[PDB]
Amino acid sequence: GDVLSTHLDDARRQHIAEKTGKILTEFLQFYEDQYGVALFNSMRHEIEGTGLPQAQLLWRKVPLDERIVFSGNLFQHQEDSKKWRNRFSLVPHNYGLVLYENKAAYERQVPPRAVINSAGYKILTSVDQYLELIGNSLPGTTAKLKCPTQFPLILWHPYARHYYFCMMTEAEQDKWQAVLQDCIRHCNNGIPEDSKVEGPAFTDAIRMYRQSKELYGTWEMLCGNEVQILSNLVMEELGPELKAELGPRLKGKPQERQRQWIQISDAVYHMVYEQAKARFEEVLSKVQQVQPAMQAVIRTDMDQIITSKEHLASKIRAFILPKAEVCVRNHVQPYIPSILEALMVPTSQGFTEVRDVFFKEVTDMNLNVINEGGIDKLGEYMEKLSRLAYHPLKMQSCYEKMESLRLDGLQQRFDVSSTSVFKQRAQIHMREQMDNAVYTFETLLHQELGKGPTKEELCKSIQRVLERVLKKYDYDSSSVRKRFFREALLQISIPFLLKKLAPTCKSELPRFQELIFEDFARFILVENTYEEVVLQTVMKDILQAVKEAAVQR
């Protein structure tokens, strides 16, 4: 039989589901523990009024009207037939990649042949690059795919299936590379950053689970929505032993064996995804049911919870602060300036490029008003400007500023994962700030225009509204960048410290549990309090490094 029927038979699928279920159970215990802590922290910020200050730019409240992002014909390699077929390929408003047999089939409202969420994917523009990337997916390879055009585009994922496209011209290749890069970035941004409770509870639980498996530091596969990330977590853990078991059973030449493993991995990824979805959504519903009860206890007992948290922290400080401060002084503090410099330069270039692109587009609109000498086509020009933050070409020069980013870890070595994650996060911030700029410009211009078509010439109020939005932009850009640099420095330095401190602490921390009043245990965790103690040991150096640099400008 075929590869999947042979190697993923019912018995093997049951074993995989059992192992997956054990991982999900352990993760969900971390998640339920984290949930009340995330709730307490968010409520403390709101009640004490210590959340993020209000931005100067306005934020769009309703999404833009849904429009197709891009479409065109592509060739796609077909896994079943091994034949290349034309496909009409469409990117909807939500940045899925949708493939139809042809455009005529699309017009007749025929179902799509595939709908692809590209979270966790990477783009390759040559077959050799792709073969190099998968070349060591099975062991011992060095211990002794052919495209109809010269312009391929390949989508690779560590666990899910790979897609093979090609285009007729370098121009089409370049366009689809930008669009698919936008798709990946959009799908990776699957948990809203301003989620108050669910987001932080989930991502902290992921980190704590990984730490319990002795995995510290930024994780490249913390991308996509919750179920995708959980699927990545399971595949990371189960992949090695599944590969060790099935690898020797695969028959053929090295690249054929590599392709069979990709097919097996995708099938397991699907099975894991559905199992994780069911298990996670069950627990999410359970925590949401008791969240109001938790809110009442937090609101009533706020001051006593803070007191209990501070008492626990004081005992942890007494235990770990000497060794922590030495480790920061000797092994973190010397390197904070260099890491900050590496992050600041491309990030600040990118935010400045957003400003320049915004300024040019508003001026181009202003030129149109002067040329028609009138207000009457403003709605047409504002509609195009309203979408600038999602323009598949015009934003590319901003995003490109991040590709020179190279970050060392605290072993003074290039950190691939930190670099990847922080380029993605920086680019998402750039998209947000561009959208805020054009939304603010539109809103303020409409206000200004209530004065009348020519109380003074329209191009004077346009340029005055533009100058007002630019000052709001410059303020918000510095706010956003300072927060981003602080967050990134913390996310590089704290996992390093926790790993160095683990032989001292991991056996000893449970002894502090007895200090937590049982009715507060959903809101206070020994581990989280300990991690906050460690965080405070780098806070001075980080705030001062971002201060002394004044990197936020």
Residue numbers in the entry: 2 to 145, 152 to 560
Task: Give me lines lifted from the publication on this model.
FAM129B (family with sequence similarity 129, member B), also known as MINERVA (melanoma invasion by ERK), is a member of a small family of proteins that includes FAM129A and FAM129C, which are present only in vertebrates. Following the first identification of MINERVA as a target of ERK phosphorylation, several studies have reported that MINERVA is upregulated in many types of cancer, including breast, kidney, large intestine, lung and endometrial cancers as well as hematopoietic and central nervous system tumors. Overall, MINERVA modulates crosstalk among essential cellular signaling pathways for cell proliferation, invasion, and apoptosis. Sequence and secondary structure analyses of 746 amino acid-long MINERVA protein indicate a PH domain on the N-terminus (residues Asp66–Gly197) and a proline-rich region on the C-terminus (residues Asp575–Phe746) which contains the phosphorylatable serine residues.
Here, we report the first crystal structure of MINERVA lacking the C-terminal flexible region, which contains the PH domain and a helix bundle domain with a novel fold. The trypsin digestion greatly aided production of large single crystals of MINERVAΔC suitable for data collection, and hence was implemented for crystallizations of the native and SeMet-substituted MINERVAΔC. Using the SeMet-substituted structure as a molecular replacement (MR) model, we could successfully resolve the native MINERVAΔC structure for residues Gly2–Lys145 and Leu152–Arg560 at higher resolution. The structure of MINERVAΔC could be divided into two domains, the PH domain (residues Ile69–Asn196) and a helix bundle domain comprising the rest of the molecule, which exhibits a distorted L-shape where the PH domain is held at the corner of the helix bundle. The overall architecture of the helix bundle domain resembles no other known structure, as analyzed by Dali structural similarity search algorithm, suggesting that it is of a novel fold. The N-terminal PH domain is tightly held by the helix bundle domain that acts as a pincer-like scaffold, with a large contact area of 1573.4 Å2. The N-terminal PH domain adopts a typical fold of a PH domain containing a central curved antiparallel β-sheet (β5↑-β6↓-β7↑-β1↓-β2↑-β3↓-β4↑) followed by a C-terminal α-helix, α5. The spatial arrangement of the two domains allows the N-terminus of the protein to be located adjacent to the PH domain in proximity, presumably for cooperative action of myristoylated Gly2 residue and the PH domain for membrane localization of MINERVA. Surface representation of the protein reveals that MINERVA possesses a positively charged patch on its membrane-interacting face, which is mainly composed of positively charged residues Lys83, Lys84, Arg86, Lys104, Arg109, Arg114, Lys145, and Lys153 of the PH domain and Arg256, Lys258, and Lys260 of the helix bundle domain, presumably enabling stable interactions of MINERVA with the plasma membrane (top view).
